[PDB]
Amino acid sequence: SGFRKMAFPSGKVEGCMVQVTCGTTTLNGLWLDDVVYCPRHVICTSEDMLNPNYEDLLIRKSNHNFLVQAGNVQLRVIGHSMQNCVLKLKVDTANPKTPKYKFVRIQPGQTFSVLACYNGSPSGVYQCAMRPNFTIKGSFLNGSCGSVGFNIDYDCVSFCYMHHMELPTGVHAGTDLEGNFYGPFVDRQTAQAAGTDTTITVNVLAWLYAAVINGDRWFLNRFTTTLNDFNLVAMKYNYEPLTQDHVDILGPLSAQTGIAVLDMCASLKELLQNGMNGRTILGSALLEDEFTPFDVVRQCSGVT
Amino acid sequence: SGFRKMAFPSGKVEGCMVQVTCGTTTLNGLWLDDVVYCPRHVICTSEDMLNPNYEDLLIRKSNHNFLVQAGNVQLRVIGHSMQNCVLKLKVDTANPKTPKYKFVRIQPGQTFSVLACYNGSPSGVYQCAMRPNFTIKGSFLNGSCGSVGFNIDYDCVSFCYMHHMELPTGVHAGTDLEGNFYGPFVDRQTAQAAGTDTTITVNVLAWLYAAVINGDRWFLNRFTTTLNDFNLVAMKYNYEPLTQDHVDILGPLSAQTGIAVLDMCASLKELLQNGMNGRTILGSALLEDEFTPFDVVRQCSGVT
Numbered sequence: 136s137g138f139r140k141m142a143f144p145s146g147k148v149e150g151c152m153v154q155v156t157c158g159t160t161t162l163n164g165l166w167l168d169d170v171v172y173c174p175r176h177v178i179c180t181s182e183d184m185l186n187p188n189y190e191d192l193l194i195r196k197s198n199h200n201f202l203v204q205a206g207n208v209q210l211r212v213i214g215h216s217m218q219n220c221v222l223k224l225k226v227d228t229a230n231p232k233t234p235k236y237k238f239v240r241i242q243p244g245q246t247f248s249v250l251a252c253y254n255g256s257p258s259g260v261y262q263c264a265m266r267p268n269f270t271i272k273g274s275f276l277n278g279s280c281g282s283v284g285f286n287i288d289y290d291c292v293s294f295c296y297m298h299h300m301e302l303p304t305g306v307h308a309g310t311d312l313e314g315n316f317y318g319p320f321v322d323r324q325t326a327q328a329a330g331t332d333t334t335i336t337v338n339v340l341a342w343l344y345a346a347v348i349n350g351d352r353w354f355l356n357r358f359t360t361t362l363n364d365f366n367l368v369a370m371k372y373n374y375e376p377l378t379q380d381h382v383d384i385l386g387p388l389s390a391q392t393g394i395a396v397l398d399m400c401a402s403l404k405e406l407l408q409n410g411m412n413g414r415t416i417l418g419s420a421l422l423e424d425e426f427t428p429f430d431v432v433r434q435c436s437g438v439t
Numbered sequence: 440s441g442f443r444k445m446a447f448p449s450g451k452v453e454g455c456m457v458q459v460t461c462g463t464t465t466l467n468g469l470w471l472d473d474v475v476y477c478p479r480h481v482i483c484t485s486e487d488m489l490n491p492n493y494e495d496l497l498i499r500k501s502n503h504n505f506l507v508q509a510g511n512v513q514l515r516v517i518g519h520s521m522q523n524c525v526l527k528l529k530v531d532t533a534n535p536k537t538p539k540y541k542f543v544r545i546q547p548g549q550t551f552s553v554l555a556c557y558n559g560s561p562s563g564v565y566q567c568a569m570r571p572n573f574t575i576k577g578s579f580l581n582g583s584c585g586s587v588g589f590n591i592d593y594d595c596v597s598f599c600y601m602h603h604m605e606l607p608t609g610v611h612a613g614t615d616l617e618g619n620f621y622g623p624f625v626d627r628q629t630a631q632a633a634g635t636d637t638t639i640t641v642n643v644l645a646w647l648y649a650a651v652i653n654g655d656r657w658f659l660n661r662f663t664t665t666l667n668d669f670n671l672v673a674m675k676y677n678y679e680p681l682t683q684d685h686v687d688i689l690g691p692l693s694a695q696t697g698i699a700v701l702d703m704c705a706s707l708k709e710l711l712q713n714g715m716n717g718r719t720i721l722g723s724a725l726l727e728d729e730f731t732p733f734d735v736v737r738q739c740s741g742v743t
């Protein structure tokens with residue numbers, strides 16, 4: 136028992152981190168097979184970021200201007216291309232530590248682990264979620280660009296995020312490994328404000344199920360509700376609307392605890408309306424929404 | 440910016456995890472050089488746990504009764520010894536992935552990363568702290584025994600914890616890598632209740648400094664206090680007494696923000712007395728105490 140914000144073991148991804156320098160900009164790259172992936176803004180100076188024309192800027196760059204260093208050995212760059220907001224640097228050597236991998240574009244509400252890196256070296260690993268407003272609440276400093284987000288299924292690493300920027304609000308924006316930003320963000324030093332950060336209802340319910348499994352049962356009440364009644368309350372509290380798809384996905388947690396999904400919705404509805412009254416759930420004084428139903432089942436069953 | 444409960448990259452420790460089976464009990468072991476470390480309760484059946492005499496039980500075990508499997512290849516056991524509550528299994532092969540390492544015994548209030556494992560395979564990584572009552576609030580299921588806690592300083596892994604048991608309250612107890620339990624716990628299936636879980640004051644102040652650095656400044660007030668006045672309030676709220684050593688350790692955070700330590704104590708004192716009033720600090724509705732001053736400086740500077 137016990138419930139923690141757990142990240143995937145990062146070893147498979149640490150073996151892929153390299154440093155990419157172009158001129159005076161140094162950031163991280165991801166080395167898979169003979170290709171190094173990195174944010175295209177590695178070719179920019181801070182002055183270029185105001186209004187960069189990446190195609191024009193890239194014309195003044197050759198293979199030898201991209202310095203790729205893995206550990207402490209230099210990789211030879213034999214090709215470069217821009218795909219959306221990422222640069223793919225073809226190196227002459229395949230990464231011998233390349234794990235089995237996929238590039239996936241995740242949906243908001245989905246969680247992933249981030250291995251924060253600086254100068255191609257890992258500093259830490261943490262778990263976060265793609266927010267409904269397509270930002271992530273990460274922990275990134277200058278130089279962290281190119282750090283990646285991923286999930287692991289047994290031996291396959293599904294890369295889903297590459298870090299590109301921090302918005303003035305301290306939230307983070309980035310792309311999938313094809314270079315497409317999550318949300319409406321653009322890799323430019325301009326006024327970009329995040330939209331409403333709504334709460335991921337299905338995740339909060341999964342975490343309520345995790346609390347029941349781990350012994351925290353005080354919030355269970357004698358009520359039930361309907362999807363429509365629950366959603367009237369959820370909209371008022373800037374919670375995402377709950378769908379039958381979400382109820383279906385919560386099925387295994389409902390089966391394990393014997394608490395019907397709509398009964399858990401009524402419990403959540405009362406927690407929204409009455410607050411916690413100074414109490415905690417799984418050591419938290421707020422409703423946690425960065426654990427998916429899959430994460431709860433995984434953590435409570437011990438998938439390796 | 441952004442502040443997350445960050446764990447160390449786990450790769451160096453993943454390369455050390457093996458599976459140890461003795462009879463019908465399977466748990467995890469740590470393979471460093473030619474020695475595999477594991478909880479001595481691997482030699483027990485659940486019936487033995489009621490009142491085990493480990494010396495007597497170990498007499499009926501030979502080298503060939505300890506099955507050590509690294510990945511999917513069997514290691515040959517050429518010696519075994521009991522040191523306190525751990526077994527050291529001498530294997531004929533040194534772990535080729537052994538990182539630079541130390542065995543350290545940590546003090547309460549110190550934080551570390553745990554790589555939770557099942558059948559010698561990593562499932563996840565999370566950060567936690569040695570509580571003042573010598574328990575840890577982990578996330579461990581049956582089979583997780585032998586999972587380790589560690590810190591990394593550049594390339595050196597300081598192993599500090601080996602997981603042994605879960606108390607009836609859902610908190611966890613374990614040993615340092617010399618087999619000595621943290622706290623008064625014994626590896627026996629008996630009535631062991633944890634003591635008062637006090638809050639690590641120095642860590643809460645470090646996290647208040649992290650919040651100021653990351654923009655959350657609403658809790659800063661116009662007051663100051665003294666160590667004695669602050670400690671009168673801290674005792675009332677089951678917070679550890681703050682010492683001049685703690686003030687000294689908070690010095691770099693005080694310098695970075697320009698907020699004197701005793702002024703931050705007055706802010707904390709008001710937060711204890713008045714509560715949060717429905718507000719949050721670094722996305723939390725409670726005062727977080729599992730970040731040391733070293734962790735705050737590390738995360739805010741990007742040590743790799």
Ligand SMILES: O=C(Nc1cncc2ccccc12)[C@@H]1CCNc2ccc(Cl)cc21
Pocket residue numbers: 176184275276277278279280299300301302307321322323324325440
């Ligand atoms: O955001 C960026 N980098 C960072 C990323 N994460 C956390 C940071 C913390 C502190 C300083 C920088 C950080 C970069 C540089 C600033 N301007 C800018 C504009 C557009 C793009 Cl695509 C990238 C950037």
Ligand SMILES: O=C(Nc1cncc2ccccc12)[C@@H]1CCNc2ccc(Cl)cc21
Pocket residue numbers: 136480488579580581582583584603604605606611625626627628629
């Ligand atoms: O605590 C133990 N294991 C576990 C450890 N962590 C989380 C667990 C969750 C669920 C089931 C077991 C868990 C073991 C078995 C039970 N009794 C026992 C008594 C003494 C000692 Cl030293 C070990 C043990």
